[PDB]
């Protein structure tokens, strides 16, 4: 399936390589089933060839005429959703970054501790099922 293709402004996309390596973008103008003109609010625009970049579920409502500034206004109106997106809602990459930066002494010590508390929960639950069984 050669990603989402269309004729319309406003569909958000998520990285599968570019430069940038973070970045979420919206398609401001549309130019065949490969190329797209992508921009993001405080970030430099590029019209770029993307056989292998795929577009996410969430769409933001924006119109024709795309400055740099117009995009920012739409982002302010939206906002909110972006926070959720990182964890779960299409993207998943941004939350994955956090895992890597979490093996750093204090962070690692805390991380191991979470699992230990979880260990106890599994035992407690298992007892309830076990009594019912036998």
């Amino acid at each position: 399936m050669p990603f989402k293709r269309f004729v319309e402004i406003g569909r958000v996309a998520l990285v599968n390589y570019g430069k940038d390596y973070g970045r979420l973008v919206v398609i401001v103008d549309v130019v065949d089933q490969n190329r797209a003109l992508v921009d993001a609010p405080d970030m430099v625009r590029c019209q770029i060839n993307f056989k292998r970049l795929s577009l996410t579920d969430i769409k933001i409502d924006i119109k024709r005429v795309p400055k740099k500034t117009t995009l920012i206004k739409a982002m302010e109106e939206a906002d909110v959703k972006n926070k959720w997106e990182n964890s779960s809602w299409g993207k998943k990459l941004i939350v994955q970054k956090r895992r890597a930066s979490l093996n750093d002494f204090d962070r690692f010590k805390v991380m191991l501790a979470k699992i230990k508390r979880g260990g106890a929960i599994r035992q407690e639950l298992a007892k309830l099922k076990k009594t019912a069984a036998a």
Partner: protein, 219 residues
């Protein structure tokens, strides 16, 4: 490039100062230099050869320089270290001081975790973001000369005597070091317990799981 620039575009600015200080005395080692020293009555053969003297002096200074800076990445006294090599490797330990040898004094408190006083190399170590406060610890007693491991000269005693085989060639525990270690360790424990759960953490060990990347892991 940046440290070496002063010397490079000077040539011998430091070494110029020393001659002029000597000359501040008046008139001196120009005259003394020709007269100065020994020679003429040889040994063995030609005596074509080598050292003591002159040569030793720059070499000792140069070997001192890697001990901070080059090896170090940056590390202040009381940084928590990971020993990646050495015997005690995988233990997280607290940094007491840097020796003249360039090896590091460390000590994990003996009771909680097995690490003794010990010398370890700087090169092995990963510098972690944690610091434990070594404000009022007497690290002073332990020095470079403190760490001489006795050789298998003879018996440990005064010398000149017929001896017995019950020496420790590659090892030696002085009794004095064991007494001293307890005192220094006591102060460290106070700092360690101040931040919670650090005490258990040191003994546990860090190692890289399958799928873990040492490059991404960097503390």
């Amino acid at each position: 490039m940046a440290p070496t620039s002063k010397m490079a575009l000077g040539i011998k600015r430091a070494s110029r100062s020393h001659t002029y200080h000597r000359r501040g005395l008046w008139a001196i080692k120009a005259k003394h230099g020709g007269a100065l020293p020994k020679a003429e009555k040889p040994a063995a053969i030609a005596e074509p050869k080598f050292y003591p003297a002159d040569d030793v002096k720059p070499r000792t200074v140069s070997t001192r320089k890697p001990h901070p800076t080059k090896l170090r990445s940056t590390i202040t006294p009381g940084t928590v270290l990971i020993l990646l090599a050495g015997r005690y490797m995988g233990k997280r330990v607290v940094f007491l001081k840097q020796l003249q040898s360039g090896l590091l004094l460390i000590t994990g408190p003996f009771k909680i975790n097995g690490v003794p006083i010990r010398r370890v190399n700087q090169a092995y170590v990963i510098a972690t973001s944690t610091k434990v406060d070594i404000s009022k610890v007497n690290v002073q007693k332990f020095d470079d000369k403190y760490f001489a491991r006795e050789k298998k000269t003879r018996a440990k005693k005064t010398e000149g005597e017929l001896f017995e085989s019950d020496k420790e060639a590659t090892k030696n525990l002085p009794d004095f070091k064991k007494d001293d270690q307890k005192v220094i360790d006591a102060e460290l424990i106070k700092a360690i317990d101040a931040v919670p759960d650090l005490k258990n953490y040191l003994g546990a060990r860090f190692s890289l799981r399958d799928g873990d990347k040492p490059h991404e892991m960097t503390f």
